[PDB]
Design goal:
PDB class: viral protein
Number of helices of chain E: 9
Largest interface: C-D, 35 and 32 residues
Shape of chain E: elongated
Keywords: Rotavirus, SPA, viral protein
Shape of chain B: globular
Structural class of chain B: alpha/beta
Largest sheet of chain E: 10 strands, mixed
Bound molecules: calcium ion, zinc ion
Organism of A: Rotavirus A
Oligomer: part of a larger assembly
Chain A: Outer capsid protein VP4
Number of strands of chain E: 14
Helix content of chain E: 25-40%
Structural class of chain E: alpha+beta
Strand content of chain B: 25-35%
Order of helices and strands of chain B: EHHEHEHEEEEEEEEEHHE
Strand content of chain E: 25-35%
Strand order of the largest sheet of chain B: 2-1-3-11-12
Entry title: SPA of Trypsin untreated Rotavirus TLP spike
Distance between the termini of chain E: 20 Å
Chains: A mainly alpha (48), B alpha/beta (265), E alpha+beta (397)
Amino acid sequence: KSTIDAAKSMATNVMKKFKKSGLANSVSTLTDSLSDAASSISRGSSIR
Amino acid sequence: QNYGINLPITGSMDIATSTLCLYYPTEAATEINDNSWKDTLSQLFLTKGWPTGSVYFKEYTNIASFSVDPQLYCDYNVVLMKYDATLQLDMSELADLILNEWLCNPMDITLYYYQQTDEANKWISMGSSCTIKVCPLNTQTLGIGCLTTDATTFEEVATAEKLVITDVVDGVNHKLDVTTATCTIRNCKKLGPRENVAVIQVGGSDILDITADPTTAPQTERMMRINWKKWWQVFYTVVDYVDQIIQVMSKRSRSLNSAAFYYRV
Amino acid sequence: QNYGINLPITGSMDITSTLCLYYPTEAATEINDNSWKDTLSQLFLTKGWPTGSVYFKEYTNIASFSVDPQLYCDYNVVLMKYDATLQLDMSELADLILNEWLCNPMDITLYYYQQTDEANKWISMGSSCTIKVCPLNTQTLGIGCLTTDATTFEEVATAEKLVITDVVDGVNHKLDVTTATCTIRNCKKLGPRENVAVIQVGGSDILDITADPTTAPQTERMMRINWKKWWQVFYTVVDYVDQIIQVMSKRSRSLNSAAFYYRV
Amino acid sequence: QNYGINLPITGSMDIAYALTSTLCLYYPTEAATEINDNSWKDTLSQLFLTKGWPTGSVYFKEYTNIASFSVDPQLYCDYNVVLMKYDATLQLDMSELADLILNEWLCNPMDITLYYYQQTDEANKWISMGSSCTIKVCPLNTQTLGIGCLTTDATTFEEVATAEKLVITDVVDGVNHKLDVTTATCTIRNCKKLGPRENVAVIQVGGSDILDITADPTTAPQTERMMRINWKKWWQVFYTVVDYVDQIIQVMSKRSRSLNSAAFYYRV
Amino acid sequence: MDVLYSLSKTLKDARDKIVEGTLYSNVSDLIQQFNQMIITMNGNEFQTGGIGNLPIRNWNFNFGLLGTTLLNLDANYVETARNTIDYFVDFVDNVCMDEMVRESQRNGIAPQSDSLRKLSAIKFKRINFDNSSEYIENWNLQNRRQRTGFTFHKPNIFPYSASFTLNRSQPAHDNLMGTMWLNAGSEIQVAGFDYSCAINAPANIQQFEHIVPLRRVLTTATITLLPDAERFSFPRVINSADGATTWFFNPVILRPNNVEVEFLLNGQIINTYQARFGTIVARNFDTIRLSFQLMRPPNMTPAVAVLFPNAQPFEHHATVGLTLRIESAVCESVLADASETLLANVTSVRQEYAIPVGPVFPPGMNWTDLITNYSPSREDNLQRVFTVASIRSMLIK
Amino acid sequence: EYIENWNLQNRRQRTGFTFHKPNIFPYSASFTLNRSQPAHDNLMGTMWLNAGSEIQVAGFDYSCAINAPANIQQFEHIVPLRRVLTTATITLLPDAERFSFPRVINSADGATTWFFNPVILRPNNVEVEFLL
Ligand SMILES: [Ca+2]
Ligand SMILES: [Ca+2]
Ligand SMILES: [Ca+2]
Ligand SMILES: [Ca+2]
Ligand SMILES: [Ca+2]
Ligand SMILES: [Ca+2]
Ligand SMILES: [Ca+2]
Ligand SMILES: [Ca+2]
Ligand SMILES: [Ca+2]
Ligand SMILES: [Zn+2]
């Protein structure tokens, strides 16, 4: 609308909470799950 | 378990041991001035159909004294509340507390700022002498119309009250100053109604606002009122019409612990 | 959200908590450190309990603790110090805090009371509970006692902080308790209280939480540890908090779906 | 012959398959003093021979106290039976001794003047034995700073033992600790509980069954090798042991570690 | 369908009866039938396949009539017949597979393959021979709308379901009461358990009921009823109703009390058996209602009085049970059963030739899903494919 | 059936006998211990009965996979047949009722006896493969 006096780093302010929202946690969980799946030849068939 | 609360019940639109506590002020016993009146009432209740040993008689000195952590003992509770013109707020607070189900959490005012989340969130304070003073804080945690360090500037919302139900503006943090030595304050939420308890008001007009909302003043079936001139007549009325009072009430709301509120840490 | 009704639950075969730790003052005395609560809080944090979720309650004795032992917490663990002369007191405390009791008032000066079945007992708590009982036959006359005279009554407790009395069922009694310093209630045992666990220190597993003489069941929530240092006791509790919690469970009366079933 | 590997063992559920050992009996000096007979060991040897044990196969070991016996209880014997006298004030000592002699422990050294120590698992304990152990621990946060204690000053450490001949310390897992053991007299090792030791059985001669050999507070297992008897005469105790040696041996078993098939599995 | 069955029957009789040395009078009628078949089928062209991996095949018929001027068949006659028989058998095999691998939401009973539609013409009616087989007999009866009936040994009429109901329960799962059943194929095993052993129940009796409604009406069924549920009589760790935890079940088996087995049709009790175990007969039913009770033993020896206390720590949980096996039954509709192989044949052809999932049958011909939702269209298509599979099995083994 | 299969075999064509409960499994009743000790106090392995036309297999672990990776213990059982079976209808059920009660079995070499006090859990990640 107006960018009232001395608007801060709005992008960084948004990202600070965006990277902690639940969506970020879900993305991290998916990446960790895929990494573990690629890592766990030994488990073989230990995922439902 | 769930008791199947998450499951539906289908019904057809064509198909075809408990205990009774009577709370009364010491004034009633003093006026009766009989030592065997409790036995007499037990026998009259027996004629009505209440087994001997099922009716209990609890006595309190005043509404203010009884407001200090009231106890609900029987499967049915009937409280005879005497009307005083100067105690409308006290009667309303006591009736709210003992007619609604409350879920209260501890408050540590000396280490935290508190706020009321929703309209159901009140602050219930009980004790020998509760004196709650409040300081609202702006978004920068600075007092509005009050200096956070200095409590003399706070705004007084209760004074030496045995029971207070404080209602402050929702979403606004408050610093509280209370006499924790003679009072405990809890963050309570009104869960709903408590059909286990009924209040018969002897005396004046129909004055009981059990809702903090100013636009709502419900008068439930459990809020009865009578005109009195003799406590013997009052008790005869209660005994004779116990069936109607019980029909208005419902014993399933009985709690395990007899406290007026469910406490969660 | 169909509260108050019991509906069958069908299942298929082919498919934020608070912890309270009660301890005797002797433990703190031996610890002789004022930062021990914070130390244990940080250790619990390592075990996963966020700071502020663990509360530490101190009681001076089993006698004092037995006077209306209110336990407000999602999980409760009571460290009970064994004394060979307090076996009944420990048993009564454990029975009171490991089971759910539904208690009604008792007006001994106005009614005669009888116990309806095996699940019914008389629980008396106060500074000094002295309970004397006179059984009455079908004619309302004392058996081995005289209702008018309380000296002839049979004494079943003396200066007891907490006492659970179990008279013969189906017979009325006249009671002579010391109501000045005691409150007696006609209680019925609904069932176990999964919220609470007892860890005895010392002794040899001496706890009868059943009035039946033919059973002395040892539930999973009744534990016993040999001890010499309260620091080691607390370290053991902290290290095995997971097992203790698994042994315990959330309080069924507390949980929603307990509405209209003696909630909380 | 294929040592060190774990090859599956296959056996049949519908086939019928139609002395040399050595026994050591540990007892307190009180027993000998009460018996007050010089040839009592010879008499028991003859009775054991009657029961089937060739003479010279039954050894009689004497310890002065539970506390003294707890200092390195070396039991090298095909079967070991320890008659320990119950004392009301020594429940933890009895439990520690029973755990030490009834479970197998793999222990590593501990130089507390060079390293902080943490227990990584429920089976990892700190076992310290000697003339006088006084263990004082300081838990450290992630900055290697003491929690409730001062890393520099030992007097602020939290004490978990005082002049203990034997003690099994269990601290909160996963957190570093700085120890102040009195190493001048007592040695402490970082031990891991491999499992039960079938060689040894303990008979408590006295009070009720109070032994628990699990650090976990939720369990107090009473295994086969933990026996208990009442007594007024040590002669009667020994007669019972001799008469029911067969039952005791059946309850026990040969030490799995010392079997020549445990080579490269922490023994032989 | 009738013509295809006649082709298969004629070929089976040709292979069985046309052997070297046989008297010509042993075959004369079959030879007349075979020559009729050759005359009818000559000059027609057929195409089969093209669905999934089933190869496309083209069939042309130009054959000479088998001779009729011998006393005893010799090697020449058998050799001349065998080539024709082999070609016809291959043709029938491919037609049957092509018809089996097809289905239709609407008019599932009608022929679906081009070859079978062609054979349904009027020019091919001259080959009908005899519809002796059970499946073709029921096909004709159903076309006339007379009453059909298939006899099954251990019919598969109960979709696989293992479940439990908890009439009493709590979060700790210490004081449960309810039922626990497996329905599979032709067997029902139902156990009613109570952790308190009816200590507080009225009259020291806990009632248990289990209702199994069948998808089709079964007739003249022999049943085996036994007083225990062997499957539900050993310690179990069982997932909770919502799958958020596990509970423990440590049964002690008592004799079921006041056992009452009802076989009901349209809500009316057709057969009722009280306290009778072993072989029983249900003449006509569509629902099975098993009622039993756990009665606390009025008298107990010490070793039982110990098991069953008054308080909550129930270590042994009283359990009663019932087992019910349908040994043999009759149904108007087609079903899978232990003895036959028609479902296996159909599923085998579909799996072998990778037939895409169509709009009627569940993937892979999953019998559980099929019987669970046995719609009229599924019944029609299933009868069609089973009949075609029987025709095929007459020649292919 | 038998004469026609005889003639088909002589003609060198495909034959087939249809069996209801074929006795294709040689009678075997045995166990394999993957983890074992002389005391048989802590065992992991499988037990099986292959008889007639039925296979009952039960994998047991005494520790309930407390120390196993991801608290999952894998069990396999391979039954080869002496002849190829075609178009077979099979019933697969999730419990081995034969190995669900207390037992005293004799050791692999017959030296001693060991105890098996089973508590039955649901089998996880059940895979049945038919191989040719
Ligand atoms: Ca007020
Ligand atoms: Ca102000
Ligand atoms: Ca408000
Ligand atoms: Ca007397
Ligand atoms: Ca007491
Ligand atoms: Ca009683
Ligand atoms: Ca020690
Ligand atoms: Ca310190
Ligand atoms: Ca540890
Ligand atoms: Zn059969």
